[PDB]
Design a protein around this ligand. Structure first.
Ligand code: NAG
Ligand code: NAG
Ligand code: NAG
Lengths: 99, 105
């Protein structure tokens, strides 16, 4: 067809080098960080990864910000529904808006 | 200030720079335990004040989060909120009351 701009760049001595980490390696790192955060909490970032149930981890997180942990255990399904709805709104916004 | 739970730091001089000696806390020897979010006693839900409910094969204890120091579940280290029909994963156990043996004796 027609001459590309990248070919005209390459013919004049300009070269683009590939990065050391491929996208699969970045995805593996992100998945490892996500699994360590979900299963262990913050324990995996300061030593060995110690398992904890996720409801108890979220009770720990509420106890961090000054709310007593019975608030989560009495409103667990509502907070789960709010989190799922917020992830759904992020998915809808990323499917709709591109700015 | 380093990797782990930070405790102290010491500065040292270097040519065109500085060197920090970060002292940290790293947990070492973990152990598997069975846990519950609450203790149902006399129709009331008991939540720990600070720490976590753990269990060996027979008994239930309360211990702090970063070190295994099990203690007898008592009304001093637990607080009451609601009943047992709401919390998911509640278990049945007894809670010690220190006033009853002092009043009886
Ligand atoms: C705990 O249990 C898991 C699976 O049952 C096992 O792989 C692990 O070695 C146990 N001990 C520790 C200290 O995690
Ligand atoms: C659990 O701990 C209690 C108190 O130390 C002890 O009496 C009991 O024998 C232990 N049970 C098991 C199965 O280790
Ligand atoms: C806990 O005790 C209550 C009443 O004592 C009983 O109705 C309930 O079934 C018990 N729970 C379990 C898991 O045994």
């Amino acid at each position: 067809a027609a001459r590309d701009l990248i070919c005209a760049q390459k013919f004049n001595g300009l070269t683009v080098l590939p990065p050391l980490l491929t996208d699969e390696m970045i995805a593996q790192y992100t998945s490892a960080l996500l699994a360590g955060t979900i299963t262990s909490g913050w324990t995996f970032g300061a030593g060995a990864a110690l398992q904890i149930p996720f409801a108890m981890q979220m009770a720990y997180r509420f106890n961090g910000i000054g709310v007593t942990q019975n608030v989560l255990y009495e409103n667990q399904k509502l907070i789960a529904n709010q989190f799922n709805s917020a992830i759904g709104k992020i998915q809808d916004s990323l499917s709709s808006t591109a700015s | 200030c380093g990797k782990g739970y930070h405790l102290m730091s010491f500065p040292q001089s270097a040519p065109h720079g500085v060197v920090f000696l970060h002292v940290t806390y790293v947990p070492a020897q973990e152990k598997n335990f069975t846990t519950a979010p609450a203790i149902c006693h006399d129709g009331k839900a008991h939540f720990p004040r600070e720490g976590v409910f753990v269990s060996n094969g027979t008994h239930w204890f309360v211990t702090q989060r970063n070190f295994y120091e099990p203690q007898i579940i008592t009304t001093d280290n637990t607080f009451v909120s609601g009943n047992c029909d709401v919390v998911i994963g509640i278990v049945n156990n007894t809670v010690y009351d220190p006033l009853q043996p002092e009043l009886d004796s």
